[PDB]
Amino acid sequence: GCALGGTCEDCLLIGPQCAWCARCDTPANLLAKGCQLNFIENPVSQVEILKNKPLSVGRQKNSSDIVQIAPQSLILKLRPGGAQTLQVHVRQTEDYPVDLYYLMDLSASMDDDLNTIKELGSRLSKEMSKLTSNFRLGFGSFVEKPVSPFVKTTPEEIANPCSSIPYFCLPTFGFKHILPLTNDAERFNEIVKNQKISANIDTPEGGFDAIMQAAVCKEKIGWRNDSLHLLVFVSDADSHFGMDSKLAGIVCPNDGLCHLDSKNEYSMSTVLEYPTIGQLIDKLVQNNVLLIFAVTQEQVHLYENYAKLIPGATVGLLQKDSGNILQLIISAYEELRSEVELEVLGDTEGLNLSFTAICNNGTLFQHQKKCSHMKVGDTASFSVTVNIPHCERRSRHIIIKPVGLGDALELLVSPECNCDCQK
Amino acid sequence: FNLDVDSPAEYSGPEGSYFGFAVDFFVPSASSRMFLLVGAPKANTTQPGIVEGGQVLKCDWSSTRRCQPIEFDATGNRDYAKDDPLEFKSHQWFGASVRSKQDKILACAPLYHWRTEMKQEREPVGTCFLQDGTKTVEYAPCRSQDIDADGQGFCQGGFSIDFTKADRVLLGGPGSFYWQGQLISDQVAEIVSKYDPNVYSIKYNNQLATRTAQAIFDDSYLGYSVAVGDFNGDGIDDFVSGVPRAARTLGMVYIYDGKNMSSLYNFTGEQMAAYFGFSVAATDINGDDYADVFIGAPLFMDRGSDGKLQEVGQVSVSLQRASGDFQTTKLNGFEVFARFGSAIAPLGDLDQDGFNDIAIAAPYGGEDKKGIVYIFNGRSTGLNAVPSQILEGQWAARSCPPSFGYSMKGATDIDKNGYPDLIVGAFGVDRAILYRARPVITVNAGLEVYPSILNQDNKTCSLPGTALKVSCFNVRFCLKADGKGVLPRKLNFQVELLLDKLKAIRRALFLYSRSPSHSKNMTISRGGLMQCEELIAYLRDESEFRDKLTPITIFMEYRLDYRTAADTTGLQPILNQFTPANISRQAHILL
Numbered sequence A: 001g002c003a004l005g006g007t008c009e010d011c012l013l014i015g016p017q018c019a020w021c022a023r024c025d026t027p028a029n030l031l032a033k034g035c036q037l038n039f040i041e042n043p044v045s046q047v048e049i050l051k052n053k054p055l056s057v058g059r060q061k062n063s064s065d066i067v068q069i070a071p072q073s074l075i076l077k078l079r080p081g082g083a084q085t086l087q088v089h090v091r092q093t094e095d096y097p098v099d100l101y102y103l104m105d106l107s108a109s110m111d112d113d114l115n116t117i118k119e120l121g122s123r124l125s126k127e128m129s130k131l132t133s134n135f136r137l138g139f140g141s142f143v144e145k146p147v148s149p150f151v152k153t154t155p156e157e158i159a160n161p162c163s164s165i166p167y168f169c170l171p172t173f174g175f176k177h178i179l180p181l182t183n184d185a186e187r188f189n190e191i192v193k194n195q196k197i198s199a200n201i202d203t204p205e206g207g208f209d210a211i212m213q214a215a216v217c218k219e220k221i222g223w224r225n226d227s228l229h230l231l232v233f234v235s236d237a238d239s240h241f242g243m244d245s246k247l248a249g250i251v252c253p254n255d256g257l258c259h260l261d262s263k264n265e266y267s268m269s270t271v272l273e274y275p276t277i278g279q280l281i282d283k284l285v286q287n288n289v290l291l292i293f294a295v296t297q298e299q300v301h302l303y304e305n306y307a308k309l310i311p312g313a314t315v316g317l318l319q320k321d322s323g324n325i326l327q328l329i330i331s332a333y334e335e336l337r338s339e340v341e342l343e344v345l346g347d348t349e350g351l352n353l354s355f356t357a358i359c360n361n362g363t364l365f366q367h368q369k370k371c372s373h374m375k376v377g378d379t380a381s382f383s384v385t386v387n388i389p390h391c392e393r394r395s396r397h398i399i400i401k402p403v404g405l406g407d408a409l410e411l412l413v414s415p416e417c418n419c420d421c422q423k
Numbered sequence B: 001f002n003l004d005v006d007s008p009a010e011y012s013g014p015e016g017s018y019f020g021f022a023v024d025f026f027v028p029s030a031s032s033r034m035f036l037l038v039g040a041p042k043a044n045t046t047q048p049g050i051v052e053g054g055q056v057l058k059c060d061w062s063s064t065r066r067c068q069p070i071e072f073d074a075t076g077n078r079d080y081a082k083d084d085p086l087e088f089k090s091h092q093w094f095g096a097s098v099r100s101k102q103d104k105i106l107a108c109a110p111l112y113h114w115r116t117e118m119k120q121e122r123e124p125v126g127t128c129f130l131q132d133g134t135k136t137v138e139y140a141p142c143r144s145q146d147i148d149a150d151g152q153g154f155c156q157g158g159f160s161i162d163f164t165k166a167d168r169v170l171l172g173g174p175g176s177f178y179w180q181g182q183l184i185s186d187q188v189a190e191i192v193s194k195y196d197p198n199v200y201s202i203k204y205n206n207q208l209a210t211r212t213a214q215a216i217f218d219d220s221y222l223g224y225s226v227a228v229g230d231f232n233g234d235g236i237d238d239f240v241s242g243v244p245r246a247a248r249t250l251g252m253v254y255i256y257d258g259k260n261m262s263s264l265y266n267f268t269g270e271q272m273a274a275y276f277g278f279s280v281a282a283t284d285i286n287g288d289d290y291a292d293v294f295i296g297a298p299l300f301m302d303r304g305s306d307g308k309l310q311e312v313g314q315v316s317v318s319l320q321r322a323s324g325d326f327q328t329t330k331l332n333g334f335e336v337f338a339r340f341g342s343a344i345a346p347l348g349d350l351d352q353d354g355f356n357d358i359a360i361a362a363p364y365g366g367e368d369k370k371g372i373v374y375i376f377n378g379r380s381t382g383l384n385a386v387p388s389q390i391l392e393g394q395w396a397a398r399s400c401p402p403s404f405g406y407s408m409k410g411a412t413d414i415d416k417n418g419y420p421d422l423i424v425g426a427f428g429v430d431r432a433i434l435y436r437a438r439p440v441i442t443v444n445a446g447l448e449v450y451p452s453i454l455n456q457d458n459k460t461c462s463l464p465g466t467a468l469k470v471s472c473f474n475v476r477f478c479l480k481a482d483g484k485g486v487l488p489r490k491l492n493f494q495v496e497l498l499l500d501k502l503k504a505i506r507r508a509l510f511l512y513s514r515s516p517s518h519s520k521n522m523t524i525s526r527g528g529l530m531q532c533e534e535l536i537a538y539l540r541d542e543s544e545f546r547d548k549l550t551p552i553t554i555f556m557e558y559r560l561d562y563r564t565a566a567d568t569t570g571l572q573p574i575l576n577q578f579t580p581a582n583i584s585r586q587a588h589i590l591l
């Protein structure tokens, strides 16, 4: 239907298959008209490879010589309506740095837990040494926003929140960053012993506040630029979110910013709302943090449904004394070593994209950008189709990168609507 | 689409008091003037030794816009014994929820803490202060003998309140029975009659309340939001409440019978932690005299074209059928992280077309996150999914977001124009804005071109100046307009005509001016028969154009004179949305 539309510029807008002869008709029918190829103007969609460095496999002694995605830079010229399929290849290296941050619930019901984690840091680094040479571990603690109605506000219960049992408990605190992740596993053990239990709470707890801060505060936590950013959430109860703090008179939404004071403590646990899952996702993805839910059976199903929405998040069944936390982290790590999922950043609300996952050699999944059950060193190919509905103003920057990895593929998508005869 | 954004009424309050956290209308009976009710829950009071007790301001609409604080309670904390406080009115958030019915005003303090008559505790039972014409009492149904968390100690009664059509109060307290939640309903007669300043735990006889349930129902937050409407067809308003943390943070909305507190229907969310039940509303949107359920879930995430989840929020529209079933239709947000569906306020018939309308706000949307309120119109099929008007915030953030639209109230004709108006609260910048509705003009334009089949060799009409006659025809246009409410009986329109609109050589033009265009001012009357003006147009000579194929389109356009047809205050009326301001006919050539 190019014969009814066509102006050279407007002739190309009515359809991606349309063309102008410097009458608006298809390039095939223009040849029958007698129009020459140099007269036929077609800004056909095309790709221009800029950086296509091959995937580096095997133990690489040089850290700046590791390539886990191919290609890396692509200028994509697209015709309004026309489509283009990109071949993206991703593969994880054998030796890659790993950051672990042990974020733990310090409710009184986690007391029996504390007696078993006392020598985890050394034990964990021992086993993780087999899998990676570069492993740094950190620590953090959370309970709940220290404001009514979440916590009792009587002067005796504020001083000691376990006064009724009675038991010696520290006052309720939102979140306390304690140990920035380092190689010294011996320092980890010393700190676990110094920790004390706070209030005994059978209600959901303010764990979500800690996750936001543990992801955003890059410097104060100490996330390495090219490593796995593992966040181990260890709790035995549910967690408040979003407007749950409306009961406390907290009506100001979380800004997704760092608010650790000089004492390494969440200063805004009485000012900002709990983060929402929509917010947590936006920050965990931006900060490249892989979340691991280590919860008890009474919370597994609940946190299982949370992890479905959060890309790169898994769960694990924790024992009541948490004596299998070592067995959970490593097994969760090995699964991430087998998972390869794609991400798209900075793209458009209006751009439509489709993904097909090509796991192994002869397996092709539709509507999937994630592969599993693959040993380290196996390749993972993806077909990303990009299409622009309208004409737009100018080019827009997009980034395609794997989940958990630092490597990324830059996309410069520039539309074309003008004619060569208009110059 | 008929809300005036040019010159709205802007009300403000003391900084940090959250002026606009709760807004409502206040209209006493008969001749008495109109007022606005803005709740400032963090406002300083003159109560002895009480910081940020909160207060509700009665804003005046006549002349100046002064708002005088209403005196519900000037007293400080009463004592159980010597040097042993019984209550803690400090930071109680009084004015967090303000509901008004006729002469009655009901404000509440959700964070009102109270000492047990047995041991020295500090439990947020929450309290309320009902105010009649002359009388003023205290209403704290959770402040009872049922103590601690397992009881109604952390009830926070008054967290959400609403009146019924039979003068009955519906109150919600999320924290009752380990945060199962609770709906309590008492007659306004017993609230004032059984009141006793010396009694702290008043027992009501005709009380309707939800009982305690199993431990599996803990952490539900029943009574987070409330609304009223009839749903079993008995005349009595029934109780609708959002239960955001029910079904493992999936969200539910309970409906109890407003007669004996019996379960009728209940909805359930589709997405995890979307806060399904944050805000509920009940209004007949399709004009079938059946209350329709509106449920908000501002944290709802949606899949876009990019295949990426994005928090935009979602409002579910459940149309009530006589069969008893609901026709649920979901409505998603527009901007990311704007939390569309935080506040849902019925507007009544905003445009007076015949169907009630509604407003849904996205408090944290727009440029600089000022705030956006969307207006949706109702129709026979249901709720028109596309908004007809967008209200934008105009104020920047200080430390907390302006929250333009966090709480709003409409369906009350304050200026007596025949059209209900709207109050939008912005506590983040301590403001409250009253938007006035504009009168709607429905205009039925008409255009007749006879004959439409022009004979080029006809040559009937004589042409002044030359002896050569030309082929001619008639152009006839009529204007009729009529509206509802208070609006001028005389309306001035400016009618413009264009012959051969689509085509370049112009093949047809009028006789008197020899020009394709024709301007004519037209003063038509409201509700009268369409006055009509006819004019003669002729076709050009055959030798002046060779285009005999393209049809000659006769185009007419009209626009209302808003300046001269404006209200005494300057409130200009508006033409209807769907009705086109321009129509066109065409003519042919036999060739």
Ligand SMILES: *[C@@H]1O[C@H](CO)[C@@H](O[C@@H]2O[C@H](CO)[C@@H](O[C@@H]3O[C@H](CO[C@H]4O[C@H](CO)[C@@H](O)[C@H](O[C@H]5O[C@H](CO)[C@@H](O)[C@H](O)[C@@H]5O)[C@@H]4O)[C@@H](O)[C@H](O[C@H]4O[C@H](CO)[C@@H](O)[C@H](O)[C@@H]4O)[C@@H]3O)[C@H](O)[C@H]2NC(C)=O)[C@H](O)[C@H]1NC(C)=O
Pocket (backbone or CB within 6 Å): B213, B214, B217, B254, B263, B264, B265, B266
């Ligand atoms: C809207 O959605 C809501 C949410 O689900 C629905 O409201 C709920 O409806 C269900 C179904 O009716 C209710 O469950 C019932 O709960 C009562 C609770 O009774 C309590 O008090 C008793 C004394 O008065 C006490 O004995 C009960 O304790 C018993 O149970 C516990 C363990 O559950 C046990 O330890 C005890 O020893 C007792 O055995 C309890 O504290 C319960 O009595 C009901 O029992 C029914 O089912 C049993 C099955 O064997 C049967 O024997 C009974 O005769 C009875 O038929 C039932 O379980 C729930 O309480 C409601 N929730 C709330 C908050 O009100 C609602 O139905 C939905 N509406 C619509 C229209 O669908």
Ligand SMILES: *[C@@H]1O[C@H](CO)[C@@H](O[C@@H]2O[C@H](CO)[C@@H](O[C@@H]3O[C@H](CO[C@H]4O[C@H](CO)[C@@H](O)[C@H](O[C@H]5O[C@H](CO)[C@@H](O)[C@H](O)[C@@H]5O)[C@@H]4O)[C@@H](O)[C@H](O)[C@@H]3O)[C@H](O)[C@H]2NC(C)=O)[C@H](O)[C@H]1NC(C)=O
Pocket (backbone or CB within 6 Å): B232, B233, B234, B257, B259, B260, B262, B323, B324, B325
């Ligand atoms: C609290 O008050 C309410 C209302 O005042 C009481 O509700 C009444 O409940 C009794 C039974 O417990 C009902 O008595 C029955 O009424 C039947 C009416 O016809 C039924 O069957 C129809 C099909 O033939 C069916 O369409 C109809 O549905 C209607 O009622 C439903 C709720 O019951 C509702 O969901 C539907 O949308 C629709 O409105 C009926 O089910 C009759 O056939 C029976 O023989 C029996 O007499 C009353 O009608 C109810 N009153 C109403 C609905 O107004 C409730 O019981 C009270 N609670 C307590 C504890 O007493």
Ligand SMILES: *[C@@H]1O[C@H](CO)[C@@H](O[C@@H]2O[C@H](CO)[C@@H](O[C@@H]3O[C@H](CO[C@H]4O[C@H](CO[C@H]5O[C@H](CO)[C@@H](O)[C@H](O)[C@@H]5O)[C@@H](O)[C@H](O)[C@@H]4O)[C@@H](O)[C@H](O)[C@@H]3O)[C@H](O)[C@H]2NC(C)=O)[C@H](O)[C@H]1NC(C)=O
Pocket (backbone or CB within 6 Å): B494, B521, B561
């Ligand atoms: C059909 O109906 C329309 C209305 O619907 C008629 O339009 C009006 O026509 C009358 C004349 O009959 C106009 O009145 C005249 O306007 C002249 C305009 O002069 C200049 O005005 C501007 C400067 O003054 C204005 O702006 C300053 C601020 O800058 C203000 O302070 C002033 O108060 C003024 O508003 C200039 O910018 C402009 O370019 C003009 O040069 C004025 O000089 C005459 O003395 C007389 O007042 C009237 O303005 C028209 N109104 C509209 C809305 O168009 C139309 O005539 C009718 N047609 C027929 C055939 O009857």
Ligand SMILES: *[C@@H]1O[C@H](CO)[C@@H](O[C@@H]2O[C@H](CO)[C@@H](O[C@@H]3O[C@H](CO[C@H]4O[C@H](CO)[C@@H](O)[C@H](O)[C@@H]4O)[C@@H](O)[C@H](O)[C@@H]3O)[C@H](O)[C@H]2NC(C)=O)[C@H](O)[C@H]1NC(C)=O
Pocket (backbone or CB within 6 Å): B014, B015, B016, B017, B042, B043, B044, B051, B052
């Ligand atoms: C209602 O009246 C209240 C009067 O008590 C008003 O409360 C004010 O609230 C602000 C915070 O919004 C407080 O500002 C604080 O200032 C301290 C610094 O104070 C220093 O001095 C005190 C001794 O007075 C000392 O204890 C401190 O350690 C400091 O050394 C900051 O640290 C805080 O972060 C905060 O900014 C005001 O102090 C407080 N007023 C008074 C008199 O204390 C309230 O704002 C009023 N409500 C409204 C709506 O206006």
Ligand SMILES: *[C@@H]1O[C@H](CO)[C@@H](O[C@@H]2O[C@H](CO)[C@@H](O[C@@H]3O[C@H](CO)[C@@H](O)[C@H](O)[C@@H]3O)[C@H](O)[C@H]2NC(C)=O)[C@H](O)[C@H]1NC(C)=O
Pocket (backbone or CB within 6 Å): B450, B451, B455, B458, B459, B460, B461, B472, B473, B474, B536
């Ligand atoms: C040739 O062109 C002329 C000019 O347009 C046409 O004259 C038009 O004729 C119609 C039909 O008679 C007129 O309509 C009216 O009909 C009612 C019927 O009762 C009558 O009461 C009116 O007095 C009038 O006749 C129309 O007004 C008239 N137009 C003009 C400008 O005079 C004529 O019909 C055309 N002839 C052919 C064969 O196409």
Ligand SMILES: *[C@@H]1O[C@H](CO)[C@@H](O[C@@H]2O[C@H](CO)[C@@H](O)[C@H](O)[C@H]2NC(C)=O)[C@H](O)[C@H]1NC(C)=O
Pocket (backbone or CB within 6 Å): B577, B578, B579, B580, B581, B582, B583
């Ligand atoms: C003639 O009237 C039609 C309406 O019937 C006008 O159509 C409008 O077109 C614009 C295009 O951007 C839309 O944004 C409007 O929503 C349309 N109007 C309606 C009521 O939907 C058309 O513009 C009018 N013609 C002229 C010359 O003004």
Ligand SMILES: *[C@@H]1O[C@H](CO)[C@@H](O)[C@H](O)[C@H]1NC(C)=O
Pocket (backbone or CB within 6 Å): A225
């Ligand atoms: C990490 O890489 C980012 C680029 O994404 C850069 O801005 C930052 O300075 C780097 N930090 C270090 C310590 O190299």
Ligand SMILES: C[As](C)(=O)[O-]
Pocket (backbone or CB within 6 Å): A047, A049, A070, A071, A085, A086, A087, A088
């Ligand atoms: C342009 As390609 C071969 O990376 O799809």
Ligand SMILES: [Ca+2]
Pocket (backbone or CB within 6 Å): A109, A110, A111, A112, A113, A236, A320, A321, A322
């Ligand atoms: Ca334990």
Ligand SMILES: [Ca+2]
Pocket (backbone or CB within 6 Å): B229, B230, B231, B232, B233, B234, B235, B236, B237, B238, B257, B258
């Ligand atoms: Ca009813």
Ligand SMILES: [Ca+2]
Pocket (backbone or CB within 6 Å): B283, B284, B285, B286, B287, B288, B289, B290, B291, B292, B319, B320
């Ligand atoms: Ca209805």
Ligand SMILES: [Ca+2]
Pocket (backbone or CB within 6 Å): B348, B349, B350, B351, B352, B353, B354, B355, B356, B357, B377, B378
């Ligand atoms: Ca309407």
Ligand SMILES: [Ca+2]
Pocket (backbone or CB within 6 Å): B413, B414, B415, B416, B417, B418, B419, B420, B421, B436, B437
């Ligand atoms: Ca009005």
Ligand SMILES: [Cl-]
Pocket (backbone or CB within 6 Å): B049, B050, B077, B087, B088, B089, B090
């Ligand atoms: Cl106090």
Ligand SMILES: [Mg+2]
Pocket (backbone or CB within 6 Å): A105, A106, A107, A108, A109, A110, A201, A205, A235, A236, A237
């Ligand atoms: Mg715990």
Ligand code: NI
Pocket (backbone or CB within 6 Å): B588, B589
């Ligand atoms: Ni024709």
